[PDB]
Structures are given as structure tokens and as C-alpha cells.
């Protein structure tokens, strides 16, 4: 709702940042293996920015990755439905 | 509104282009350190094109980067709601 979809995103972004590191360590070559950049990666992912500096290589990494897209893209296609209503209405008044 | 969401985008695109350079200089390796390409980068970002030729490496760079996504993606998921109504209605008539 007002800021409710916002929160659920941030669960997913953290949660996902965390499991990303858990899944990706042990895979020889993974780029995505410290909690900080895992967190930036999951924003990169939920917003579908696509800079492409980080991504997963393991299977469970990609699995986490899909949850973030689904859960974040639905978050964001609802957090951005809402910065669009409140702020456009404020500037409409 | 009509072209109101448009303007707020362009504040964010400039403002963001500017702080991008401010944040990213000093970080040894940053690609994102002249005002021109900072400006193209923040379009790359607000439209989630993802060519991935530029992005931030510092923390404050990523912070700016998230503001641009949020503020631009909401802009654009409202500027493109509007090129879609006026132009589709013009071609509907």
C-alpha cells in the first residue's frame, strides 16, 4: 500500500543479498561473494538496470536471482506506481 | 501531469549526472568522471537500458545511482504513460 510494498522489497533485497553470498561462495569464479556488493547486486536486479558488473554463476545463485526479480520487480512495479501518485498529485495541487 | 513528470525527471537526470561526477572522482578506477558521460549514464539508468558501458564503483556513486533509478523510473513510468495517451488518442482520432 502506501509504503507497504516498499518494505517487502527491502526484505527481498536484504534476504536476497544474503543468500546470494551463501549460494555463490564455493563456486570457483563467482564475483558475487561479499555482503555489500551482493546488496548492490540485488538492486541492480530488482530495478532492472542491467549495468552487468555483477551476476550469479551457480544454480542456486540464479534461483535467488529469480526470486529477487519476481519479488523486486513486483515491489518496484508498485513502489513506482506510488511515488507516481503521491508526488504527481502533490505537484497537481 | 501533462509535462510535469517530464521536468522532475530532468532535474534528477542533471542533478544526478552532477553528483555522479562528484562522488566518483577520487575512486581509483571510476569510468564515470566527466559531466557529459555522467549525463548519458543517468539516462542509461532512468531508462533501464542497461548497455552497461558506464556505472558507479564508489558507495556514494551507487547511492546517487539508486536515486536516479527510483526518481527516473517513476518519472519514466509516467512520462511514457503520457506519450502513450496523447499520441495514441491523436492517432485514435
Amino acid at each position: 500500500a502506501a509504503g507497504a510494498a516498499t518494505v517487502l522489497l527491502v526484505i527481498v533485497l536484504l534476504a536476497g543479498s544474503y543468500l546470494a553470498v551463501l549460494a555463490e561462495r564455493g563456486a570457483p569464479g563467482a564475483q558475487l561473494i561479499t555482503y555489500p556488493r551482493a546488496l548492490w547486486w540485488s538492486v541492480e536486479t530488482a530495478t532492472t538496470v542491467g549495468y552487468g558488473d555483477l551476476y550469479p554463476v551457480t544454480l542456486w545463485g540464479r534461483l535467488v536471482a529469480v526470486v529477487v526479480m519476481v519479488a523486486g520487480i513486483t515491489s518496484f512495479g508498485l513502489v513506482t506506481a506510488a511515488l507516481a501518485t503521491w508526488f504527481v498529485g502533490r505537484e497537481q495541487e | 501531469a501533462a509535462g510535469a513528470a517530464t521536468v522532475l525527471l530532468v532535474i534528477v537526470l542533471l542533478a544526478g549526472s552532477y553528483l555522479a561526477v562528484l562522488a566518483e572522482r577520487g575512486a581509483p578506477g571510476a569510468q564515470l568522471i566527466t559531466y557529459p558521460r555522467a549525463l548519458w549514464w543517468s539516462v542509461e539508468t532512468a531508462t533501464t537500458v542497461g548497455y552497461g558501458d558506464l556505472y558507479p564503483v564508489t558507495l556514494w556513486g551507487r547511492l546517487v545511482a539508486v536515486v536516479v533509478m527510483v526518481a527516473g523510473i517513476t518519472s519514466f513510468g509516467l512520462v511514457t504513460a503520457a506519450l502513450a495517451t496523447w499520441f495514441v488518442g491523436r492517432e485514435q482520432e
Epitope: 555463490e24 561462495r25 569464479g29 564475483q31 561473494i33 555482503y35 | 564503483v57
Partner: antibody, heavy 117, light 106 residues
């Protein structure tokens, strides 16, 4: 002393040995514990890391995988099971505490292992 | 397994003088290099983290430069308490790896 591990172990060849590391200080969710091996007059060889709160561990690909890592969530001590040892396995064995951000902030004083009959 | 290459293997220097150790990596690793000092009989001791950032409790003598594949630790003046082995360590791809190390001699 943030990471705190025994001084020396003596092992007959072929035998196993379990190495400890009690870790006062903070006991974060996200903390990893690593194990680096320093043969005499050599440099540091990473060996394996473990996240104790969550269980899972990861070992060095390219060395003969002798060891197996374990943890005790409520005792803040973590273990490393070196198994069937030779003399090539005698070295100092450090544990380090990596916050999750990729450097070893903290290092145990290290456990000198000697494999001889 | 990213290959961190510290040359020279040993480093002479007259005291009070700047000194630099190079750690070159087998591919670009951004800034995810971190330096450790390890004296005789002691465990290693994080000196510099993420190439440039400094650790609290470390002399201001120690300074860290570099990015990509070429990295450098530096001591703007030396004293006899710095004789030790110095390692680099990359955290940019799994597994984390260590440099071969450089000994400082005076």
C-alpha cells in the same frame, strides 16, 4: 584475544586431529571463519571458510581435500577436522574472522601441528 | 584462482626511506586487494584494506595505492619495526587467494 586457538598438536601419521577456535567479542550472524595454513618457510595457503550460524562450509578446490569444517553455534567455537595426515601436513594453522566484506580483520595466534611418530 | 604476484621477493632499503611493494593480479580485480604484515613468530595483521583504505591502529606511514591489476603498498619512511613479511590477498572472485609475499630487509 579475539580469536583464540590451541598452541600445538602432535599427530601420528595416518591419524586425524580436530582443531579449535573460540571467538570472544562479537558473534555476528554473517561472520565467516577461515583457515589459513602456513607451512614452515612458506606463505599462507587458504584452506576453507565456514559460516557458523548457517552451517555451510567451502574448501580450497586445488589442495588435497583432507579437512572438514564444523561449528558450534552456542559456544562460539569452530572446528577443523584434518584427517589421515602425512608430514607434508605439518604447519601452523590460523583461523581468521572475515566479517563478510572479504578481508581477515582478526587472526588467531595459530596452532603448530607436527606429524611424527 | 586469481594469481597474485608480488615481485621482488625481498626488498633492501636504508632506513627512513620510502619503500613500495607491488602486487600484480592475473586479471583485473578492481580494488578488492588487502595487505597484511606478518612478523617473525606472529600471525598476520591487516594493514590496508581495499587497496586504499586504512585500518585504525596502523601507523600513518603505511599507504596503499593501486587499482585493476597493478597494486602497491608503501611506507612513507621506514623504521626497524617494519621488518616483516607482507602479503596481498584478493577478495574479488572466489576463492580468496594470497600473494607469495615480500620480506622487508634494512
Amino acid at each position: 584475544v579475539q580469536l583464540q586457538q590451541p598452541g600445538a598438536e602432535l599427530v601420528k601419521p595416518g591419524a586425524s586431529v580436530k582443531l579449535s577456535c573460540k571467538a570472544s567479542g562479537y558473534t555476528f550472524t554473517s561472520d565467516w571463519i577461515h583457515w589459513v595454513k602456513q607451512r614452515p618457510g612458506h606463505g599462507l595457503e587458504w584452506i576453507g571458510e565456514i559460516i557458523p550460524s548457517y552451517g555451510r562450509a567451502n574448501y580450497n578446490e586445488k589442495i588435497q581435500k583432507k579437512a572438514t569444517l564444523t561449528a558450534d553455534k552456542s559456544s562460539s567455537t569452530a572446528f577443523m577436522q584434518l584427517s589421515s595426515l602425512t608430514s607434508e601436513d605439518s604447519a601452523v594453522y590460523y583461523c581468521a574472522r572475515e566479517r563478510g566484506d572479504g578481508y581477515f580483520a582478526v587472526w588467531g595466534a595459530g596452532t603448530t601441528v607436527t606429524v611424527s611418530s | 584462482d586469481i594469481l597474485l604476484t608480488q615481485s621482488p621477493a625481498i626488498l633492501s632499503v636504508s632506513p627512513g626511506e620510502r619503500v613500495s611493494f607491488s602486487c600484480r593480479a592475473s586479471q583485473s580485480i578492481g580494488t578488492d586487494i588487502h595487505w597484511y604484515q606478518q612478523r617473525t613468530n606472529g600471525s598476520p595483521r591487516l594493514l590496508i584494506k581495499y587497496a586504499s583504505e586504512s585500518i585504525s591502529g596502523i601507523p600513518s606511514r603505511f599507504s596503499g595505492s593501486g587499482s585493476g591489476t597493478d597494486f602497491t603498498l608503501s611506507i612513507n619512511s621506514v623504521e626497524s619495526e617494519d621488518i616483516a613479511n607482507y602479503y596481498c590477498q584478493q577478495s574479488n572472485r572466489w576463492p580468496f587467494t594470497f600473494g607469495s609475499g615480500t620480506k622487508l630487509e634494512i
